[PDB]
Amino acid sequence: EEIEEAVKEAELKVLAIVLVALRSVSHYEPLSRLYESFLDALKKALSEEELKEVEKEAERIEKK
Amino acid sequence: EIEEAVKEAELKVLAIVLVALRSVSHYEPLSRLYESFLDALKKALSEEELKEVEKEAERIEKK
Amino acid sequence: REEIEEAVKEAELKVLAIVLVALRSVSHYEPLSRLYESFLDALKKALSEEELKEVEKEAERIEKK
């Protein structure tokens, strides 16, 4: 069925949680290096639309 | 039907990250990422979800 | 069915590969080194050896781009 879709929602939600956490601390040395590392790894591993979906889910979490 | 098993993937990955962050939360500034992560966990998941990551993290820590 | 087991496992292991790649590439800075080692130890407890092997392949895949 749509297993691919359901698998992807879980990926994107976990990765958005990690993104929120790294973002909060991204100006303490050297966590800024891990922030940019994580973002680089997301860009390589996810499609462009998925990456935008991670970033949107992160902002949703960050306004909560 | 299956978002239940979707959820188990989530909580088990989050539990593995939590375990890694707990074992180094005494090396600064990692304690800030440990707290940021617990703060992101609390925001993003219901309390039942949070406690499942916790118990899964305990089962991992006991291995 | 068995399509959901391969599903959950697959989601789990690519996400862990992404985090692994992120940590690996900054592991010389301290104490990011320590969080890297500690992630590797957590993977060793939580994952089987074939799950760990699959995480590392996905990690090399990502690093290769």
Numbering used by the authors:
A (entry chain D): 5 to 68
B (entry chain F): 6 to 68
C (entry chain E): 4 to 68
How is this structure described in the published paper?
To evaluate design accuracy we attempted crystallization of 19 designs and succeeded in solving crystal structures for seven (three C2s, two C3s and two C4s). All crystal structures had the correct oligomerization state and closely matched the design models (median Cα RMSD of 0.6 Å across all designs, with resolutions ranging from 1.8 to 3.4 Å). The side chain conformations in the crystal structures also closely match those of the design models. HALC3_109 is a homo-trimeric three-layer all-helical structure, with three inner helices splaying outwards to contact two additional helices from the same protomers at angles of roughly 25° and 90°; the closest assembly in the PDB has a TM-score of 0.69.
